[PDB]
Design a protein around this ligand. Structure first.
Ligand SMILES: *Cc1cc2c(c(*)c1C)Nc1c([nH]c(=O)[nH]c1=O)N2C[C@H](O)[C@H](O)[C@H](O)COP(=O)(O)OP(=O)(O)OC[C@H]1O[C@@H](n2cnc3c(N)ncnc32)[C@H](O)[C@@H]1O
Ligand code: NA
Ligand code: NA
Length: 490
């Protein structure tokens, strides 16, 4: 009551929703992307605020401090555990939902842009396209991902070998801190500005907007998608890929999707069929690539083409907010520094991918620019020596069908333990996986020791600096969730 009273005083009432508001269920559900987290057994926010101005965010945070009510911020709602809009255990929180703050302003000539956190990647990419056919930004593959969470947790996609992660291409921010204060890079200082760009969402304050540098791409890029079944030699070919792909020139990224005894090699090349053909013949002849495989197109066209296989529907694929794809979903991730033995690839393709509840495995090769950044230069530590990342994705479509995929996800992660990174076993912060560990709260503050268990997996040697920065900007642990950076204070 106290908290709501404060909000009503400062923010338009049409932007405030209580559980009893008729529109609350659809406001809550509008960017939930995982059917596991939409059902009524999930813990719901007491209130939802949908700011349209930065002053509304500040008022909301000031109210939350005064009345001791915590806020989970949501931009695109893609959090794998839904931590932008649900808690694991009953507790009081409000959601500050940024979907209405979605402006993107591109300065083509300066090659910079200001992008609101509530914009989806598709909208950012489209706006860049309206400004220039030869500029791009290196962020996620899926068009509906929110800018806010994608950037805060790092953010990578088919330009990662060329330009690294989204967070290392951010040149300023506009942020509201745990005391409701408005900050930019200059006011927040090196530590806070280092942490917010890749140190995970929520922990370091609400980013309202990000200023990004825009990067050159040729007017024509080339995509191929070449599949090999095991009888076509997928095992030998992927065994070679793991050594070659991380060593390829930075203009060529070849990722793999596998969902049975068959691997599809999806490439984005910053250039033409005419130069890709000889490069492949020279560096990776085992794949058997020829000019018939080439799909030449602009960078903007490559986004729906890579993610959805569509060539013909630019605006609908990039500017969509209908939220129609809502699988029940589980996800895990690993990083690989040493080549798998051929026998492991044999097991993966022939055995693991043919079990009840078996999911899809995606393999993104590193090296080049992403690996050239030192491990501590940003909070994202998965850099020098990384051959590839693995994402293990399970989708299902009926609420009664969870047992087999959940069980497969657990089993394959156990199987893979000897072959992937260890001490710690690294994982990508934006592929959030609560089973890596969760925080313990003592005297209303997340403990450092509990945070460290999962924190070293996402952030490796960067965890302690993240926590010291957290202690400086938010010593009372106001902006938190079950897996956010704990404050390390003296
Ligand atoms: C759903 C999904 C997710 C990803 C891909 C595809 C699809 C369909 N593919 C992908 C991803 N990540 C990549 O780097 N490359 C890819 O190709 N996926 C994961 C995605 O990057 C993460 O889920 C990301 O955190 C989602 O961001 P979001 O859509 O904005 O999600 P939430 O609103 O749930 O927020 C996540 C997390 O960050 C905090 N948060 C949200 N907004 C802010 C702001 N403005 N400031 C600070 N912190 C923020 C949330 O509280 C939550 O903890
Ligand atoms: Na290690
Ligand atoms: Na999970």
């Amino acid at each position: 009551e106290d908290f709501l009273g404060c909000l009503v005083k400062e923010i338009p009432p049409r932007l405030l929703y209580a559980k009893s508001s008729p529109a609350y269920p659809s406001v809550l559900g509008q960017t939930i992307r995982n059917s596991r987290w939409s059902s009524p057994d999930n813990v719901k926010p007491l209130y939802i605020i949908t700011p349209t101005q930065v002053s509304h965010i500040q008022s909301a945070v000031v109210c939350g401090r005064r009345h001791s009510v915590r806020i989970r911020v949501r931009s695109g709602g893609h959090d794998y555990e839904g931590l932008s809009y649900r808690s694991l255990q009953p507790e009081t929180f409000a959601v500050v939902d940024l979907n209405k703050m979605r402006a993107v302003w591109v300065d083509g000539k300066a090659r910079t842009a200001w992008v609101d956190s509530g914009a989806q990647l598709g909208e950012l990419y489209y706006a860049i396209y309206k400004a220039s056919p030869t500029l791009a930004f290196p962020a996620g593959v899926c068009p509906t991902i929110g800018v806010g969470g994608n950037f805060a947790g790092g953010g990578f996609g088919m330009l990662l070998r060329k330009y690294g992660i989204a967070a290392e291409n951010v040149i300023d921010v506009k942020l509201v801190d745990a005391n409701g204060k408005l900050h930019d890079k200059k006011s927040m200082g090196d530590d806070h500005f280092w942490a917010v760009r890749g140190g995970g969402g929520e922990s370091f304050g609400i980013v309202v907007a990000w200023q990004v540098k825009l990067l050159p791409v040729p007017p024509t890029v080339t995509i191929f998608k070449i599949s090999k079944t095991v009888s076509e030699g997928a095992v030998d070919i992927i065994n070679k890929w793991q050594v070659v792909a991380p060593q390829l020139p930075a203009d060529l990224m070849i990722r793999i999707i596998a969902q049975g005894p068959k691997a599809t090699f999806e490439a984005m090349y910053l250039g033409t069929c005419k130069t890709l053909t000889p490069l492949m013949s020279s560096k990776f002849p085992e794949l058997g690539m020829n000019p018939s495989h080439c799909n030449e197109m602009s960078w903007i066209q490559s986004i729906p083409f890579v993610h959805l296989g569509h060539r013909d529907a630019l605006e609908d694929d990039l500017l969509n907010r209908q939220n129609s794809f809502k699988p029940f979903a589980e996800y895990k991730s690993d990083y690989v520094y040493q080549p798998f033995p051929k026998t492991v690839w044999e097991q993966i393709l022939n055995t693991w991918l043919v079990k009840p509840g078996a999911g899809i495995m995606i393999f993104d090769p590193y090296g080049a620019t992403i690996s050239a950044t030192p491990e501590s230069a940003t909070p994202f530590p998965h850099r020098k020596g990384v051959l590839f990342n693995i994402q293990y994705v399970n989708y299902w479509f009926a609420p009664g069908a969870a047992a087999a995929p959940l069980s497969w996800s657990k089993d394959i992660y156990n199987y893979m333990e000897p072959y992937v990174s260890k001490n710690p076993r690294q994982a990508y912060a934006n592929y959030r996986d609560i089973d890596l560990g969760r925080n313990e709260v003592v005297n209303d503050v997340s403990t450092y020791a509990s945070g460290k268990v999962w924190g070293q997996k996402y952030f490796k040697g960067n965890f302690e600096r993240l926590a010291i920065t957290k202690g400086k900007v938010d010593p009372t642990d106001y902006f938190r969730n079950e897996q956010s950076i704990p404050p390390l204070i003296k």
